[PDB]
Amino acid sequence: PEIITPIITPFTKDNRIDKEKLKIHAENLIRKGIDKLFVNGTTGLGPSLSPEEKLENLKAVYDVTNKIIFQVGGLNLDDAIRLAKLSKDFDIVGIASYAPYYYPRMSEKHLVKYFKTLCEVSPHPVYLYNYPTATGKDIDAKVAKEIGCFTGVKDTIENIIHTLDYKRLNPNMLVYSGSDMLIATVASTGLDGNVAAGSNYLPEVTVTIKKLAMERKIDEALKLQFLHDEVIEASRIFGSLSSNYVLTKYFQGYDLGYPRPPIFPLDDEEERQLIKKVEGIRAKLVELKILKE
């Protein structure tokens, strides 16, 4: 099993992608053991990015690694098709798409045709990004099977039954979970890893949890999983997507700039409160030799 980071898109103060901070971030995450980087995901604010900005993100991260899954989805299919075909000049792991978001009451038939169309033109293997809360619909194990062209799936959903079912009905599919809180459980039950936004700022924690669980030291994996769970919870207090920035700076030294409003940056006072709620944890993570400090 692997840890995959849905990597943050860092922005300037005037709302452009800061390619250099993004290279620093990426450089460090690979250094610290992250298997793959999932670019333009929820944590990178892919829905808020233009097609051109989504390619910018790919190119910057490609200046560091090939271990990329390139998310190209959106509400303009011509634009997604375009990005899928542009990716042929990149030796990367694959491309990905969430389901078309926002519009409720879309037929299964239309959702299938959306994906089968991306499969027909993709130069790389295709990964499904299932996030029902965010997109309003669910490409479950059976629909993924009907589509019949996915190499892997990231299943962001609390129901691990749902996630296991992809493996049960598609035994050759790489099946990853989108939860940071299930890193331990995933490694231990026979699934292929986690796409874990929390690995942006505590990649050490996520890699260690996977290893302890790979090593069948379950009580120890759980103990660390539970500390990371408290960190996830803290980041949700002010909005996980904004907090992901403050927590990378705090835990990993470098600054990622700003999010893109309406994903508003925390203010200095929120930054401080968020720190205060994790500095006890950081202590225990250095006391546990997982963090350098």
Ligand X SMILES: O=C(O)C(=O)C[C@H](O)[C@H](O)COP(=O)(O)O
Q: Which residues are annotated as a binding site for substrate?
A: 42-43, 129-131, 154-156
Distance of alpha carbon 101 from alpha carbon 21, whole angstroms = 29
Judged by beta carbon, residue 125 or residue 239, the one nearer a second copy is 239
What does the H/E/C string look like for 18-44?
A: CHHHHHHHHHHHHHCCCCEEEECCCCC
The entry of a second copy, ligand X, none near residue 6 (CB within 5 to 8 angstroms by kind) is: ligand X
Place of tokens 């037929």: 107
Considering only residues 66 through 95, tell me which ones interact with ligand X, judged by CB under 6 A: none
Backbone conformation region of residue 15, classed left if phi is above 0, alpha if psi is from -120 to 50, else beta? left
Using CB under 6 A, pick the residue from 29, 58, 126, 195 that binds ligand X. Answer: 195
Does 201 sit near ligand X (CB under 6 A)? no
Distance of alpha carbon 10 from alpha carbon 68, whole angstroms = 17
Smallest gap from residue 117 Cβ to a second copy (A) = 8
Does 142 sit near a second copy (CB under 8 A)? no
Distance of alpha carbon 148 from alpha carbon 128, whole angstroms = 11
The entry of ligand X, a second copy, none near residue 147 (CB within 5 to 8 angstroms by kind) is: none
Distance of alpha carbon 259 from alpha carbon 93, whole angstroms = 27
Per DSSP, what are the bridge partners of residue 153? 128, 175
Using CB under 8 A, pick the residue from 33, 82, 101, 145 that binds a second copy. Answer: 101
User: Is residue 85 annotated as a catalytic residue, yes or no?
Assistant: no
Using CB under 8 A, pick the residue from 12, 52, 63, 103 that binds a second copy. Answer: 103
Does 188 sit near ligand X (CB under 6 A)? no
Residue ranges of E strands in the chain: 2-6, 36-39, 68-71, 94-98, 126-130, 150-155, 174-177, 193-195
Q: Using CB under 8 A as the criterion, which residues of the chain lie in contact with a second copy when the complex forms?
A: 15, 42, 45, 47-48, 50, 75-78, 100-107, 110-111, 113-114, 117, 133-136, 158-162, 164-165, 167-168, 179, 181-182, 184-185, 188-190, 216, 218-219, 221-222, 225-226, 229, 236, 238-242, 260-264
Query: What positions carry a catalytic annotation?
Result: 154
